[PDB]
Design a protein around this ligand. Structure first.
Ligand SMILES: C[C@@H]1O[C@@H](S[C@@H]2O[C@H](CO)[C@H](O)[C@H](O)[C@H]2O)[C@@H](O)[C@H](O)[C@@H]1O
Ligand SMILES: C[C@@H]1O[C@@H](S[C@@H]2O[C@H](CO)[C@H](O)[C@H](O)[C@H]2O)[C@@H](O)[C@H](O)[C@@H]1O
Ligand SMILES: C[C@@H]1O[C@@H](S[C@@H]2O[C@H](CO)[C@H](O)[C@H](O)[C@H]2O)[C@@H](O)[C@H](O)[C@@H]1O
Ligand SMILES: C[C@@H]1O[C@@H](S[C@@H]2O[C@H](CO)[C@H](O)[C@H](O)[C@H]2O)[C@@H](O)[C@H](O)[C@@H]1O
Ligand SMILES: [Ca+2]
Ligand SMILES: [Ca+2]
Ligand SMILES: [Ca+2]
Ligand SMILES: [Ca+2]
Ligand SMILES: [Ca+2]
Ligand SMILES: [Ca+2]
Ligand SMILES: [Ca+2]
Ligand SMILES: [Ca+2]
Lengths: 114, 114, 114, 114
């Protein structure tokens, strides 16, 4: 099944944050309506934040997270969770190797903001 | 129902990151085994990371998130989500006022790390 | 925080299924746009399905689950989870006593159907 | 990533319920410790509950959901969510064709019971 794709409400501000837990450098791309809206790159084995940004979901609401290490696409796992019918999290895990911890890059998208 | 309390696997490192979306200064307290392990404070209406730390769940695995604004306990909502039977997120939202956006402080706990 | 309230897409069919795990008879009311759309009652300590129905979300898409036992409203816990940006689950547990298993009635809403 | 596989606490009762939303006959198999513990089959475009059962997770606690149509394995999606640190749902969707609604068989596992 496709993973790392989420339909947000249109024209909404949202936060995107990425963490790294790998000896490899993680590159995280966030596409909005199929155009790169944020790119984070960094390396950590201690859950360091490698980037955070505020974005707007635009007219489509379509947000996609992609992860690669040295040009190789990581395998993704994802889900969206809504608390009290208001607070939204779109969560992404990624695996760059063999151990299947799926934490190599971790991406959290939250809305609403403000 | 109790919110913002999670049983993690014992003796496990976990990430805890807090975001602010409110006029009010948010104070996030993270307890492990009922003892304060981290305190974040900050103010933003643009989802600024007001703190991020790596902690250990210790022998109990009992982790609790509290949020207060100027001393007043915020109302919490929470859940845990597990992807591919491996990647864990504990999520907390909090409301300091009347608008019920539940984003005033947002706390994300993730494990495993490394 | 309010629990047991979910905003579905408007004019969309959804499944609702209730399960009981208590010595007391459980009454589950499902409201659509603030009007009773279905009512289920049953007693089980073995997770028996005490009711199932297909309903329409109507123009608001607002769906509310209420649970009571012998007249007394149960304490509710809820969340919505979306998998592969497509498959929606609205989940409710409820507590009628002191043991805090929150399974005394369990209500599962799923969409889309067909 | 592996989908439809869940680690439960050992020797615990859980409910499993399957729903169908397809013109094809769905076969849902539930494995405990890699052995078939329940089987449900049926065809519905209206969210019929094609089966519900109470099982015991056994000594491993490993539970797996498999779905097929006419012997062809369906693509699965899954997650686990925990409410008030107590109430557990393991959720599975499955796709038998090309439209990617992932609702063709839906399976929900809940614990604890009683
Ligand atoms: C620490 C370790 O990092 C990787 S495994 C690691 O990946 C790099 C990528 O550049 C090299 O291929 C090494 O040969 C590999 O050992 C993570 O997948 C793993 O979970 C762990 O965090
Ligand atoms: C921007 C706004 O912030 C608060 S409402 C705000 O709360 C502060 C708390 O110190 C004072 O009560 C102000 O008088 C209030 O208006 C959030 O609850 C709200 O969601 C929004 O982010
Ligand atoms: C078996 C038991 O059922 C209840 S406790 C039970 O509640 C009924 C009403 O539902 C009466 O108040 C009795 O006096 C109580 O003992 C559940 O709360 C519990 O989890 C367990 O399933
Ligand atoms: C109603 C429809 O059913 C299938 S698509 C459907 O699958 C059967 C399987 O036996 C045949 O291949 C038909 O030729 C196909 O049209 C679902 O995938 C779809 O979501 C929808 O529920
Ligand atoms: Ca890895
Ligand atoms: Ca890793
Ligand atoms: Ca607020
Ligand atoms: Ca706010
Ligand atoms: Ca109870
Ligand atoms: Ca009970
Ligand atoms: Ca389908
Ligand atoms: Ca279908």
């Amino acid at each position: 099944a496709t993973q790392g794709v989420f339909t947000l409400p249109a024209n909404t501000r949202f936060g995107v944050t990425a963490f790294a837990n790998s000896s490899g450098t993680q590159t995280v791309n966030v596409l909005v309506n199929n155009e790169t809206a944020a790119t984070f790159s960094g390396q950590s084995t201690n859950n360091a934040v490698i980037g955070t940004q505020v974005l707007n979901s635009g007219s489509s609401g379509k947000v996609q997270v992609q992860v690669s290490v040295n040009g190789r696409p990581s395998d993704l796992v994802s889900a969206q969770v809504i608390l009290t019918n208001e607070l939204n999290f779109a969560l992404v895990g990624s695996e760059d190797g063999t151990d299947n911890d799926y934490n190599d890059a971790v991406v959290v998208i939250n809305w609403p903001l403000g």
